[PDB]
Write a structure and sequence with these properties.
two-stranded antiparallel sheet, 10 strands, homodimer, binds S-adenosyl-L-homocysteine, S-adenosyl-L-methionine (chain B), Alpha/beta knot, about 220 residues, 8-stranded mixed beta sheet, alpha/beta
Chain lengths: ~220, ~210
């Protein structure tokens, strides 16, 4: 199982893009968050409710822990709400606790990439917009939305062409319209008759893709 | 859906038990913040991982199976405390706010608006009358959850024990369980084991 990156535009895979991710640093440098920085966000005149980097953190853990990741058939990108685009190497160990995650994101946003000790390989890297320049050549692009017709993921995946990847844009936000990828996507689809958290929408999509692709 | 509790011995449901869960107050003890204290407490600092319990609870209670009313969660902490989770509790999304809620629960023994409730061990005295008990573990044969679930009788619940511990043998349920099963050829985090079970049961029970 070779490690997938944007250089490979052929291999059929699943891609998840965590869009409108709230990853923004402020010098106290910390990753702005609604719990710790209410006072600051308020005196900044920002919407207190929108600084939710915990959503991106939880989605990353969900996604990189999944069997489809371990089987080498997942890539994740992050598009932040400030327009930064980040390619996540499949093998990166995202810190399990929010505090260490926050430290890692500050370093990434400042330096533009993170490598390991011992290796030049970038495990996280800021790359140039737009995301469509990096995705596979044959890639169905979908936004997940409560407001769109509900699909069974297995069925949807089984309808892909044999050489066609699937890129899912998921809003990594507490609230907002699901229009964040309307210029890239082919279709919007819902996964449930209930509204879901971004992380659960991620897990549900991954599970369905695992099932359709016989990844256990 | 009417809210499932252990009082109802009959309704077919999925139950997940977060076993060996690290939930202890001093704040919630955790490896990131309390390394110095843990080593004065002669503890393996790497065991204090309430983040795992936090993540599993978000995964479980956010799942369509919960929203359809067909899920119950219990937590068995590493100090032997048993907690029944009310299906309608809103788990705080951030770890800092999660800690604040657990602290209250552990001290007062109950949270209400009973959203969270300390109950008497063992967990098997609370389970539905007809209930298969399974431990999820990388070390057992690998099932497709949908198929395994479809094999339950029409009146038979399933209770899944998931290790919410940092590492360790999956023997935390050995004297309680009917069977051990694997969910993957790859090692899984506890929260991923949970979603895999929830999602396979959603597919088996036509919950969308
Ligand atoms: N039932 C559903 N089906 C598919 N995706 C969903 C969903 N419910 C939520 N999502 C996805 O999960 C993300 C975060 S949910 C928060 C934003 C959402 N627009 C709202 O107002 O509630 C959404 O952006 C969307 O990408
Ligand atoms: N491949 C797999 N199949 C089924 N369950 C798994 C699994 N991998 C992990 N789990 C569940 O997730 C829990 C946490 S993973 C950490 C515990 C693991 N026994 C270890 O020492 O490495 C496990 O206790 C198990 O209940």
């Amino acid at each position: 199982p070779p490690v997938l990156t944007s250089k490979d535009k052929i291999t059929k895979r699943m891609i998840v893009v965590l869009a409108m991710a709230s990853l923004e640093t402020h010098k106290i440098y910390v990753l702005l968050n609604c719990d710790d920085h209410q006072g600051l966000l308020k005196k900044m005149g920002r919407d207190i409710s929108e600084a939710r980097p915990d959503i991106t953190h939880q989605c990353l853990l969900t996604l990189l822990d999944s069997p489809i990741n371990k089987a080498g058939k997942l890539q994740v990108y992050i598009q932040t709400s400030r327009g930064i685009l980040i390619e996540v190497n499949p093998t990166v160990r995202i810190p399990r606790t929010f505090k260490r995650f926050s430290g890692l994101m500050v370093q990434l946003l400042h330096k533009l990439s993170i490598r390991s000790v011992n290796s030049e390989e970038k495990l996280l890297k800021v790359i140039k917009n737009p995301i469509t320049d990096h995705l596979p050549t044959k890639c169905r692009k979908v936004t997940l939305s409560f407001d769109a017709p509900v699909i069974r993921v297995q069925d949807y995946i089984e309808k892909l062409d044999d050489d066609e990847s699937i890129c899912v844009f998921v809003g990594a936000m507490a609230r907002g319209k699901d229009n964040f990828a309307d210029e890239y996507v082919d279709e919007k689809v819902g996964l449930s008759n209930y509204p879901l958290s971004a992380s659960v929408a991620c897990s549900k999509f991954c599970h369905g893709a695992e099932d359709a692709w016989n990844i256990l």
